[PDB]
Amino acid sequence: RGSFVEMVDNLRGKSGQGYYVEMTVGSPPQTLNILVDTGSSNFAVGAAPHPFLHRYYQRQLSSTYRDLRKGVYVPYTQGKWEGELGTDLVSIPHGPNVTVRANIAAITESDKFFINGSNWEGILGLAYAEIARPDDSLEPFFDSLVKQTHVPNLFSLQLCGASVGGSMIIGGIDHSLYTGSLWYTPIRREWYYEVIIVRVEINGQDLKMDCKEYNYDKSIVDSGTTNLRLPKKVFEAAVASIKAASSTEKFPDGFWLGEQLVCWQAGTTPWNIFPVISLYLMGEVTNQSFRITILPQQYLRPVEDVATSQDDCYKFAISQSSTGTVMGAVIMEGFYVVFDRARKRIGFAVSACHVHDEFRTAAVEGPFVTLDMEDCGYN
Numbered sequence: 001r002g003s004f005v006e007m008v009d010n011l012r013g014k015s016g017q018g019y020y021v022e023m024t025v026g027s028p029p030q031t032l033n034i035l036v037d038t039g040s041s042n043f044a045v046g047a048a049p050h051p052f053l054h055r056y057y058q059r060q061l062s063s064t065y066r067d068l069r070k071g072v073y074v075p076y077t078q079g080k081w082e083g084e085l086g087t088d089l090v091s092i093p094h095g096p097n098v099t100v101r102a103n104i105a106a107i108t109e110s111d112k113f114f115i116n117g118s119n120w121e122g123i124l125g126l127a128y129a130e131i132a133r134p135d136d137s138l139e140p141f142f143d144s145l146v147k148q149t150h151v152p153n154l155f156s157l158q159l160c161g162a163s164v165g166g167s168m169i170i171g172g173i174d175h176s177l178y179t180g181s182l183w184y185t186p187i188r189r190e191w192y193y194e195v196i197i198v199r200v201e202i203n204g205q206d207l208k209m210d211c212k213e214y215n216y217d218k219s220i221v222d223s224g225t226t227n228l229r230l231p232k233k234v235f236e237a238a239v240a241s242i243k244a245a246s247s248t249e250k251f252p253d254g255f256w257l258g259e260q261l262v263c264w265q266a267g268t269t270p271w272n273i274f275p276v277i278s279l280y281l282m283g284e285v286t287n288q289s290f291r292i293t294i295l296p297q298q299y300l301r302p303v304e305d306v307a308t309s310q311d312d313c314y315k316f317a318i319s320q321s322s323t324g325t326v327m328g329a330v331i332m333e334g335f336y337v338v339f340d341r342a343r344k345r346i347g348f349a350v351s352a353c354h355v356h357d358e359f360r361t362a363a364v365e366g367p368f369v370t371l372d373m374e375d376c377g378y379n
């Protein structure tokens with residue numbers, strides 16, 4: 001409990017490409033690098049020589065592979081994969097000292113799914129069976145891990161942004177990875193990691209929307225998405241406040257829609273003109289909330305692969321949503337996040353590794369008094 005030295009720094013990634021962990025599958029073990037995704041629930045790995053893949057799962061080499069004789073077709077909004085379901089023995093080298101028999105979707109065809117140039121070749125869906133494909137009888141990896149071992153039913157994530165890195169602590173919490181205290185919000189339903197946002201402020205100014213708009217139709221914590229996505233009506237109000245707060249400089253319209261980058265001369269990004277963003281989350285106790293606060297360092301993402309600039313370029317990484325609020329790597333990179341599945345709650349603390357400057361820091365503060373927090377959930 002509280003100290004897992006062998007798991008610290010076991011995540012890697014590149015800007016824009018997500019955070020992955022090394023895993024082994026099959027006997028003898030095949031090493032693969034696997035995207036950590038709290039927004040999905042399948043363990044799915046490339047299993048054919050797609051040209052973007054460094055490595056892929058070769059079932060024929062595994063003596064412990066068992067075929068489930070069942071295919072799966074998984075389309076998303078952007079991209080799709082198709083594959084064949086089986087089980088095999090799985091380990092995490094920089095994780096608990098255990099091996100489990102887990103479901104694996106061996107991906108045999110994909111479109112817009114793998115990233116050309118990335119170093120990962122599969123996804124580890126850490127959410128719940130309710131959103132597993134093809135249905136909820138396909139037990140997710142973490143469920144199998146907990147059923148089959150003595151690993152406690154929780155994991156925690158410290159995502160360190162810009163190469164990027166961080167830590168996934170499986171079965172516990174490591175107190176060296178955060179400062180101050182953890183504050184917990186209830187998991188409202190076990191499918192995604194769904195939470196309820198009760199108030200939103202831009203530089204301390206409340207947006208003053210009906211709080212149900214903040215969770216229309218849900219709000220989730222998702223390490224497999226870069227942006228903070230906000231329901232459309234909330235995005236419109238949020239951008240209008242951020243423009244107002246920032247208006248000592250003028251940016252093109254397209255910038256705010258994520259349609260154009262903005263660039264400054266290296267070493268002089270004026271962080272100080274941009275406001276902080278606070279989300280108040282429902283707390284553990286009736287009429288009690290806490291707030292998490294992020295900086296422009298989290299929501300203005302550096303874009304390095306800009307082959308027609310000099311020069312320091314950023315994308316605005318808050319975007320409109322049709323799927324509810326998505327607290328992606330923009331929120332998560334400020335905090336140490338604890339997915340305390342055993343107590344159905346999510347903890348937030350200030351991350352010991354978050355990017356900040358000498359004037360402002362990310363913050364997790366409470367308790368606040370907020371009434372009618374149950375009306376904020378959308379049904």
Ligand SMILES: N#Cc1ccc(C(=O)Nc2ccc(F)c([C@]3(C(F)F)CCOC(N)=N3)c2)nc1
Nearest residue numbers: 016017018039040076123222223224225226329
């Ligand atoms: N920071 C950061 C960051 C950058 C890229 C990605 C990424 O490419 N995810 C990804 C790629 C393909 C998918 F299909 C998914 C899905 C899939 F696995 F469900 C669907 C979209 O949302 C989620 N959460 N996962 C995620 N993730 C996180």
Ligand code: NA
Nearest residue numbers: 146147149150
């Ligand atoms: Na167990």
Ligand code: NA
Nearest residue numbers: 175176178179
């Ligand atoms: Na600490």
